[PDB]
Design a protein around this nucleic acid. Structure first.
Ligand SMILES: [Cl-]
Ligand SMILES: [Zn+2]
Ligand SMILES: [Zn+2]
Ligand SMILES: [Zn+2]
Length: 121
DNA sequence: TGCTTCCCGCGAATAACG
DNA sequence: CGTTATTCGCGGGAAGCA
Protein backbone atom coordinates (compact mmCIF):
# COMPACT_ATOMS: atom_id res chain seq x y z
CA UNK A 1 0.00 0.00 0.00
CA UNK A 2 1.59 3.25 1.25
CA UNK A 3 3.63 2.07 4.26
CA UNK A 4 5.30 -0.93 5.82
CA UNK A 5 5.91 -1.80 9.47
CA UNK A 6 9.00 -2.18 11.61
CA UNK A 7 8.95 -3.80 15.04
CA UNK A 8 11.69 -3.40 17.67
CA UNK A 9 11.00 -4.22 21.34
CA UNK A 10 7.42 -4.78 20.46
CA UNK A 11 7.67 -1.14 19.49
CA UNK A 12 5.70 -0.54 16.34
CA UNK A 13 6.81 1.97 13.77
CA UNK A 14 5.20 2.82 10.50
CA UNK A 15 7.55 3.49 7.58
CA UNK A 16 6.59 5.65 4.62
CA UNK A 17 7.41 3.71 1.44
CA UNK A 18 8.68 6.79 -0.40
CA UNK A 19 11.01 8.71 1.94
CA UNK A 20 11.20 5.96 4.57
CA UNK A 21 10.27 8.37 7.39
CA UNK A 22 9.28 6.74 10.69
CA UNK A 23 6.02 7.35 12.62
CA UNK A 24 4.61 6.06 15.92
CA UNK A 25 1.02 6.67 14.80
CA UNK A 26 -0.43 5.66 11.46
CA UNK A 27 -2.59 8.82 11.32
CA UNK A 28 0.68 10.75 11.35
CA UNK A 29 2.07 8.72 8.43
CA UNK A 30 -1.11 9.32 6.46
CA UNK A 31 -0.98 13.04 7.33
CA UNK A 32 2.59 13.12 6.06
CA UNK A 33 1.99 11.06 2.90
CA UNK A 34 -0.25 13.68 1.26
CA UNK A 35 2.99 15.62 0.81
CA UNK A 36 3.96 12.94 -1.72
CA UNK A 37 0.56 12.05 -3.19
CA UNK A 38 -1.32 15.39 -3.10
CA UNK A 39 -4.59 13.44 -3.09
CA UNK A 40 -5.93 16.22 -0.86
CA UNK A 41 -5.44 19.90 -1.54
CA UNK A 42 -5.65 22.54 1.19
CA UNK A 43 -5.98 25.90 -0.68
CA UNK A 44 -5.67 29.28 1.08
CA UNK A 45 -9.04 31.06 1.06
CA UNK A 46 -7.34 34.46 0.81
CA UNK A 47 -4.86 33.85 -1.97
CA UNK A 48 -3.84 31.09 -4.38
CA UNK A 49 -1.35 29.13 -2.25
CA UNK A 50 -2.00 25.42 -1.81
CA UNK A 51 -0.86 23.33 1.19
CA UNK A 52 -0.46 19.55 1.68
CA UNK A 53 -1.48 19.76 5.36
CA UNK A 54 -4.50 21.47 6.82
CA UNK A 55 -2.47 22.94 9.71
CA UNK A 56 0.00 24.58 7.30
CA UNK A 57 -2.89 26.37 5.62
CA UNK A 58 -4.39 27.42 8.95
CA UNK A 59 -1.17 29.04 10.16
CA UNK A 60 -0.89 30.73 6.77
CA UNK A 61 -4.43 32.18 6.89
CA UNK A 62 -3.93 33.48 10.43
CA UNK A 63 -0.95 35.31 8.95
CA UNK A 64 -3.47 36.83 6.48
CA UNK A 65 -5.85 38.18 9.12
CA UNK A 66 -3.20 39.70 11.38
CA UNK A 67 -4.85 38.28 14.49
CA UNK A 68 -2.49 38.10 17.47
CA UNK A 69 -3.56 35.18 19.66
CA UNK A 70 -0.44 34.73 21.79
CA UNK A 71 -0.24 37.14 24.72
CA UNK A 72 2.63 37.59 27.15
CA UNK A 73 1.15 37.66 30.64
CA UNK A 74 4.12 39.61 32.05
CA UNK A 75 3.66 42.85 30.11
CA UNK A 76 0.60 42.30 27.90
CA UNK A 77 2.16 42.28 24.42
CA UNK A 78 0.42 40.07 21.88
CA UNK A 79 2.04 37.99 19.08
CA UNK A 80 0.87 36.16 15.95
CA UNK A 81 2.46 32.80 16.89
CA UNK A 82 4.19 30.64 19.45
CA UNK A 83 7.70 31.42 18.25
CA UNK A 84 7.45 35.24 18.46
CA UNK A 85 5.83 35.00 21.88
CA UNK A 86 8.51 32.56 23.13
CA UNK A 87 11.35 34.61 21.69
CA UNK A 88 9.91 37.70 23.36
CA UNK A 89 9.47 36.08 26.74
CA UNK A 90 13.00 34.58 26.70
CA UNK A 91 14.75 37.77 25.57
CA UNK A 92 12.75 40.45 27.44
CA UNK A 93 11.67 38.56 30.56
CA UNK A 94 14.46 35.94 30.71
CA UNK A 95 12.00 33.11 31.24
CA UNK A 96 10.98 29.94 29.41
CA UNK A 97 7.36 29.22 28.44
CA UNK A 98 8.07 25.45 28.24
CA UNK A 99 9.05 25.42 31.92
CA UNK A 100 6.86 25.04 35.00
CA UNK A 101 4.97 28.38 35.07
CA UNK A 102 2.19 29.68 32.82
CA UNK A 103 3.63 32.74 31.08
CA UNK A 104 1.39 33.26 28.06
CA UNK A 105 -2.24 33.03 27.07
CA UNK A 106 -3.44 31.59 23.79
CA UNK A 107 -6.71 33.31 22.92
CA UNK A 108 -9.46 31.60 20.93
CA UNK A 109 -9.07 32.19 17.19
CA UNK A 110 -11.67 34.85 16.26
CA UNK A 111 -10.36 36.26 12.99
CA UNK A 112 -11.45 33.13 11.12
CA UNK A 113 -13.47 29.97 11.62
CA UNK A 114 -11.46 26.97 12.88
CA UNK A 115 -12.16 24.25 15.46
CA UNK A 116 -12.24 25.73 18.96
CA UNK A 117 -10.65 24.05 21.94
CA UNK A 118 -12.89 24.53 24.98
CA UNK A 119 -9.90 24.80 27.32
CA UNK A 120 -9.05 28.17 25.75
CA UNK A 121 -11.44 29.73 28.32
C1' DT B 1 22.14 33.85 13.13
C1' DG B 2 17.60 35.12 13.82
C1' DC B 3 13.58 34.91 11.83
C1' DT B 4 10.27 31.64 9.33
C1' DT B 5 8.08 27.41 8.30
C1' DC B 6 8.22 22.63 8.98
C1' DC B 7 7.44 18.50 11.71
C1' DC B 8 4.91 14.84 14.51
C1' DG B 9 2.99 12.75 19.11
C1' DC B 10 -0.80 13.70 21.46
C1' DG B 11 -5.74 14.07 22.09
C1' DA B 12 -10.00 17.20 21.62
C1' DA B 13 -13.69 18.32 18.28
C1' DT B 14 -16.27 16.59 14.97
C1' DA B 15 -17.83 13.75 10.89
C1' DA B 16 -19.15 9.49 9.29
C1' DC B 17 -21.55 5.23 10.53
C1' DG B 18 -25.08 2.37 11.76
C1' DC C 1 -29.02 10.25 17.93
C1' DG C 2 -24.80 7.08 20.68
C1' DT C 3 -20.52 5.15 18.89
C1' DT C 4 -16.14 4.69 16.20
C1' DA C 5 -13.46 6.65 12.93
C1' DT C 6 -11.34 10.71 11.25
C1' DT C 7 -9.51 15.38 11.19
C1' DC C 8 -6.49 18.68 12.62
C1' DG C 9 -4.99 22.22 16.47
C1' DC C 10 -1.18 22.79 19.55
C1' DG C 11 3.64 22.72 21.68
C1' DG C 12 7.94 23.33 21.10
C1' DG C 13 12.14 21.56 18.94
C1' DA C 14 14.10 21.06 14.39
C1' DA C 15 15.08 22.16 9.84
C1' DG C 16 15.26 25.76 6.31
C1' DC C 17 16.38 30.16 4.83
C1' DA C 18 18.99 34.55 3.14
CL1 LIG D 1 -5.95 40.34 17.96
ZN1 LIG E 1 7.24 10.06 3.01
ZN1 LIG F 1 -2.81 32.91 1.45
ZN1 LIG G 1 6.26 40.50 27.74
Amino acid sequence: DDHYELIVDGRVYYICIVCKRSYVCLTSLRRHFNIHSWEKKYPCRYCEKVFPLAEYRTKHEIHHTGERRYQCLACGKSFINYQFMSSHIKSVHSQDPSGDSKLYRLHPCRSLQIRQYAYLS
